[PDB]
Write a protein that binds this ligand. Structure first.
Ligand SMILES: CC(C)S(=O)(=O)N[C@H]1Cc2ccc(Cc3ccc(C(F)(F)F)o3)cc2C1
Ligand SMILES: N[C@@H](CCC(=O)O)C(=O)O
Ligand SMILES: N[C@@H](CCC(=O)O)C(=O)O
Lengths: 263, 263
């Protein structure tokens, strides 16, 4: 029928969406800034709709409970129809693609290792063959799933360790994993997406480092409930933005341009 | 209705599809080898269909004629229903996505520069600010389109030169562009996808080099005629193969493992 204001679910995750420092003196979409804020603006213009940014209530990306089969996070919000579109760093996975539609990816990533600077680790293989340095992942996300489902020897080795490690090596938010890297004096490494890894690397206090190659090749896509009218228009808009250079321009804006660790 | 042998259009393009040296003493699919041959086998198994590999009659990727509006190449073959699926290094573009369905990408690429070794060029900017060294692209493809449609200063500068260069700087096949790089004594550089650039770099006579960063970020997707029943199954199979590590394994097989220029 007649066009509705589109409800957008997203996640507070640097540099994609952040509360502006002065958010309290602002209302609506103006409260927020970052790569996915800007991308929301572009997609909305190109598909000709009005929208409201809403941070995902539980603060999670999206995972199905093995028992209940209930989806949580931003995926949950699409699945149960609380939100019309998710515009966030949400990784295209098989388990998600079956319950929600994904645009072609708007940004690439792969799983990667953050160390505190000077940590004697260069790779995942290094992590797997030692125990002095603890390591983990975000909860409720594609990185955790990757390790749990991996048949590859080293990642299976890593997963068997991580699932049973005491204290827990898993974290609620990316900012928590980073905090743990920075405070653990080289005795914690964090497994996170290269995109986030690279952003943080170029942020004060400039004490972290991405090491080794990526463990996989995947992408973020814009997600809509299965069969939503927004799917096709959103997918075309992503490819047009790609082809206009907008995505690279936005990547430059929120990564390189934000760099505060020198050249 | 009842399952038909699926007609697969593909292109002779190293290392994706090649005639085996002994192809003449072979019949059917067995004549061919390479990354997309193997990927065809996997997709077919996972979607449970039988298929016949056919090389695209005109040897082109796919471009619409400005006058007639006729699609040529593998895109043409899908559009006019000569083929049921294209399994090849076929770049996801906006103009193609409107006339055919694309899987999520199975491999990434970006536009890149091949030089003969010792050519005093490190970038696209370098190419644009000189004239002694000629440069071009493949005909009938996404790289040519990228330059023609670019509003970015340097690529617009490059396109204005390339479209009017005498003799023609455009080539019919990748193997022709490479041949021209190798025979032109450093006086030709070739603009081609990084994937192809990287393969050739590691092939005898080991006289070529990828220089500079990629001009864009795009991907290859499996393509089907718009609304084909194969679309969704093929798309899920690509994500499952990604997640099983098959795609990386196949990338290793046909790139690194084929390397004959040392380490
Ligand atoms: C196959 C799935 C795991 S995925 O996450 O969708 N595909 C993975 C592999 C890959 C390859 C290239 C890219 C980069 C990119 C941007 C835009 C496009 C376009 F061509 F589709 F438009 O391609 C991302 C990914 C992630
Ligand atoms: N992008 C991930 C979250 C980050 C991570 O898992 O490392 C997801 O969509 O689940
Ligand atoms: N992959 C390209 C062909 C190679 C090129 O244009 O450089 C296409 O699909 O058109």
């Amino acid at each position: 029928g007649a066009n509705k204001t589109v409800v957008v679910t997203t996640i507070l995750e640097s540099p994609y969406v952040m509360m502006k420092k002065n958010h309290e003196m602002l209302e609506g979409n103006e409260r927020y800034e970052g790569y996915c804020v800007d991308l929301a603006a572009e997609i909305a213009k190109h598909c000709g709709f009005k929208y409201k940014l809403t941070i995902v209530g539980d603060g999670k990306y999206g995972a199905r409970d093995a028992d209940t089969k209930i989806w949580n996070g931003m995926v949950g919000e699409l699945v149960y129809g609380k939100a019309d579109i998710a515009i966030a760093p949400l990784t295209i996975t098989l388990v998600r693609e079956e319950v929600i539609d994904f645009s072609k990816p708007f940004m690439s990533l792969g799983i990667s290792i953050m160390i505190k600077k000077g940590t004697p680790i260069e790779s995942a293989e290094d992590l797997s063959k030692q125990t002095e340095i603890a390591y983990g992942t975000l909860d409720s996300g594609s990185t955790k799933e990757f390790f749990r489902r991996s048949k590859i020897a080293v990642f299976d080795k890593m997963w068997t360790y991580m699932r049973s490690a005491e204290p827990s090596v898993f974290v609620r938010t990316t900012a928590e994993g980073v905090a743990r890297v920075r405070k653990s004096k080289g005795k914690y490494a964090y497994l996170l997406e290269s995109t986030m890894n690279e952003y943080i690397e170029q942020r004060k206090p400039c004490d972290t480092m991405k090491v080794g190659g990526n463990l996989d090749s995947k992408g973020y896509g814009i997600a809509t409930p299965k069969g939503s009218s927004l799917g096709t228009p959103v997918n075309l808009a992503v490819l047009k933005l790609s082809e206009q250079g907008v995505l690279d321009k936005l990547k430059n804006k929120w990564w390189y341009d934000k760099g505060e660790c020198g050249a």
